[PDB]
Amino acid sequence: MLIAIEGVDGAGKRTLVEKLSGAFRAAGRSVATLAFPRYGQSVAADIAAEALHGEHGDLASSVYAMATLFALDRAGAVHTIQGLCRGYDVVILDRYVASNAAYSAARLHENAAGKAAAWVQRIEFARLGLPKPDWQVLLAVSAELAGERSRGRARARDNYERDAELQQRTGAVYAELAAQGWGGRWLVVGADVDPGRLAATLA
Amino acid sequence: MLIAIEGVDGAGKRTLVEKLSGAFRAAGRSVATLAFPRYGQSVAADIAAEALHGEHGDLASSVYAMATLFALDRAGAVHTIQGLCRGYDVVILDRYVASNAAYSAARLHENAAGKAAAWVQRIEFARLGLPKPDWQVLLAVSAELAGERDNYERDAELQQRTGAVYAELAAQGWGGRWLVVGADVDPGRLAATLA
Ligand SMILES: Cc1cn([C@H]2C[C@H](O)[C@@H](COP(=O)(O)OP(=O)(O)O)O2)c(=O)[nH]c1=O
Ligand SMILES: Cc1cn([C@H]2C[C@H](O)[C@@H](COP(=O)(O)O)O2)c(=O)[nH]c1=O
Ligand SMILES: [Mg+2]
């Protein structure tokens, strides 16, 4: 059971993942969680983070270069994810493939029907062989509240987080992805969602 | 001993790799060779080539992104390089870390003493762990002779400036000692000089 948690920056994903893990375990299911990008476990991830903070020359200026590094990070995580799914009943991922599609489209002012979304789909699911998630849960939230959360919980904000319009468009692209079942079945929830009920719903 | 053969497209690196290897073997030394980018064996390498052919949107428009891909390709070969270095007296690499410094600087109109070349050293050698070559052999060729024999290959201006950064990397001893040679260099004398 592979579950992916998606959403904009400051949406509260970490928290949702926490509550959901407990609920699942409460219902006796073994849970494992993994977050992307894998800071500290991937050079591709680390360079991506440093790039979002202005480092590495013109790296961050390329939408596809950034998407590639995140995709390369997940690719190096294929055996890790398969290993988790084998050792636990529920594997929960804080951010996954859909993140790349939502942000890349948003940075290019494209929607779910744009080239970037389709490109991410082919690259990660078809070529890099990333395991399709059984569930993609979009934690939808107020753009203002999310923006403020990042501002408060800030370590300094990167170039994506300081881009209020990028965040709004990313929220919108996410909604389109969820509505059309991009990459599988989605579940849209709010911050005030009941863990136990959500868990019972997903599993 | 780890040896890297550097040079622009059309310099004749493969031929030199072949001759130098035969020379070392004749001198009673085992030799293994490896070529970069590892097209067909690396995803980073393949995406880079594809990007150089107009694929993957705006990826190729970024100098550092392209540079990062070639470096990640080399990173994936560290274990292979370390295995060769343990098994053979001489390991010859057709294109290595200096290629990234040369092409990146050339794309940015920088010189061997600039930011990009310094960046490549900080990334590949220390962060990624690529062994620093004992010798970097530059098969120097003028733009005219090279021109006589993707986005990069098609750019003569880029090829010319790349040759220029190579000439400077060699003079400044970027990443270690260098040797400049021509496609007519005598294998035996070269092997004796590198021994
Ligand atoms: C995982 C991932 C993140 N991103 C974006 C979303 C975030 O702005 C940023 C970093 O991811 P994030 O999980 O927000 O990291 P941090 O812990 O540093 O806040 O990059 C992508 O564009 N694609 C991806 O595949
Ligand atoms: C290995 C490597 C190649 N390149 C380049 C030069 C070539 O134009 C292209 C592919 O190399 P190739 O022609 O030897 O197969 O990528 C870099 O810019 N940096 C590197 O580190
Ligand atoms: Mg974030």
A110 neighbourhood in chain B, CB within 8 Å: none
* Rounded distance between C-alpha atoms, residue B141 and residue B163, angstroms: 7
Domain that holds residue A83: 1-203
Nearest CB among A47, A61, A75 relative to B68 is that of A47
CA distances from B15 to A123, B19, B191 (A): 36, 6, 15
Could you say which ligand is closest to the alpha carbon of residue A103? 1
How many other CB atoms are found less than 10 A from the CB of residue B57? 19
Asked if the Cβ–Cβ distance from A59 to B64 is below 8 Å, we say yes
Partners of residue A31 on adjacent β-strands: A90
In degrees, rounded to 5, the angle at the alpha carbon of residue B57 between the alpha carbons of residues B43 and B45 is: 20
| Interchain CB contact of A30 with B (< 8 Å) | no
Asked whether B1 and B193 are in contact (CB, 8 A), the reply is no
CA atoms within 13 A on the CB side of B135: 19
- Strands B135-139 and B31-35, by their bridges, are unpaired
In degrees, rounded to 5, the angle at the alpha carbon of residue A43 between the alpha carbons of residues A60 and B88 is: 130
Nearest-CA residue for ligand 2 atom 12 is B37
Q: Exposed/middle/buried for B111, CB within 10 Å: 0-12, 13-18, 19+?
A: middle
Q: At what angle do helices A143-152 and A164-179 cross, to 10 degrees?
A: 130
Distance from CA of A175 to the nearest CA of B (A): 24
Looking at ligand 2, which atom is closest to the CA of residue B35?
A: 14
Nearest chain B residue to A46 by CA distance is B127
Helix H or strand E segment including A186: strand A186-189
Question: Is cis: bond before B131, omega within 30 of 0?
Answer: no
End-to-end distance of chain A based on CA atoms, in angstroms?
A: 8
Where helices occur in chain A by DSSP H, the ranges are 13-26, 43-52, 63-75, 78-87, 97-107, 115-121, 143-152, 164-179, 195-202
Report the separation in Å between the CA atom of A38 and the middle of ligand 1, taken as the mean of its atom positions: 10
Question: Is cis: bond before B133, omega within 30 of 0?
Answer: no
User: What CATH code is carried by the domain that includes residue A73?
Assistant: 3.40.50.300
Q: Which residues contact B173 (CB under 8 A, 6 or more apart)?
A: none
Asked if the Cβ–Cβ distance from A56 to B64 is below 8 Å, we say yes
* Rounded distance between C-alpha atoms, residue A96 and residue B132, angstroms: 36
Could you say which ligand is closest to the alpha carbon of residue A6? 1
Q: What is the DSSP letter of B124?
A: I
Reduced to 3 states (helix: H, G, I; strand: E, B; else coil), residue A2 is: strand
Q: What is the DSSP letter of B131?
A: P
A8 phi and psi, to 5 degrees? -70, 170
| Interchain CB contact of A59 with B (< 8 Å) | yes
- Strands B2-6 and B135-139, by their bridges, are parallel
- Strands B135-139 and B177-181, by their bridges, are parallel
Q: Exposed/middle/buried for B91, CB within 10 Å: 0-12, 13-18, 19+?
A: buried
Positive or negative: CA dihedral A88, A93, A96, A102: positive
Asked whether A137 and A106 are in contact (CB, 8 A), the reply is no
Resolution (A): 2.3
Q: Exposed/middle/buried for A47, CB within 10 Å: 0-12, 13-18, 19+?
A: buried
How many other CB atoms are found less than 10 A from the CB of residue A122? 10
* Rounded distance between C-alpha atoms, residue A74 and residue A96, angstroms: 8
What region, left, alpha or beta, does residue A129 occupy, with left being phi > 0 and alpha being psi -120 to 50 degrees? left
Q: Which residues contact A106 (CB under 8 A, 6 or more apart)?
A: A166, A167, A169, A170, A172, A173
Q: What DSSP line would sit under A112-148, residue for residue?
A: TTSHHHHHHHIIIIIIS-PPPPSEEEEE---HHHHHH
End-to-end distance of chain B based on CA atoms, in angstroms?
A: 8
This entry's atomic model was obtained through: X-ray
From B108, A142, A19, select the one nearest A5 (Cα to Cα): A19
* Rounded distance between C-alpha atoms, residue B67 and residue B91, angstroms: 23
In degrees, rounded to 5, the angle at the alpha carbon of residue A69 between the alpha carbons of residues A9 and B165 is: 130
A58 neighbourhood in chain B, CB within 8 Å: 62-65
| Interchain CB contact of A122 with B (< 8 Å) | no
* Rounded distance between C-alpha atoms, residue A138 and residue A134, angstroms: 13
* Rounded distance between C-alpha atoms, residue A182 and residue A197, angstroms: 24
* Rounded distance between C-alpha atoms, residue B22 and residue B31, angstroms: 8
From A6, A3, A1, select the one nearest A100 (Cα to Cα): A6
Helix H or strand E segment including B170: helix B156-171
Name the token pair of B151.
């986005």
* Rounded distance between C-alpha atoms, residue B40 and residue B36, angstroms: 11
A62 neighbourhood in chain B, CB within 8 Å: 58-59, 61-62, 65
Pocket-forming residues, ligand 1, beta carbon under 6 Å: A 9, 36-37, 49, 52, 70, 95, 99-100, 103, 160-161
Name the token pair of A4.
């992916």
B92 phi and psi, to 5 degrees? -110, 120
Strands of the sheet with B177-181, listed across from one edge: B31-35, B90-94, B2-6, B135-139, B177-181
Report the separation in Å between the CA atom of A59 and the middle of ligand 2, taken as the mean of its atom positions: 18
**Residue B58 marked ligand-binding:** no
Asked if the Cβ–Cβ distance from B65 to A63 is below 8 Å, we say no
| Interchain CB contact of B49 with A (< 8 Å) | no
* Burial letters A157-174, b for 16+ CB under 10 A, else e: bbebbbbeebbbbbbbbb
Task: Find the length of chain B.
Answer: 195
Could you say which ligand is closest to the alpha carbon of residue A99? 1
B16 CA to centre of own chain = 13
* Rounded distance between C-alpha atoms, residue B36 and residue B45, angstroms: 9
* Rounded distance between C-alpha atoms, residue B85 and residue B4, angstroms: 13
Domain count for chain B, please give it: 1
Name the token pair of A98.
């859909």
Name the token pair of B112.
């061997």
Report the separation in Å between the CA atom of B136 and the middle of ligand 1, taken as the mean of its atom positions: 39
From A107, A119, A117, A124, select the one nearest A170 (Cα to Cα): A107
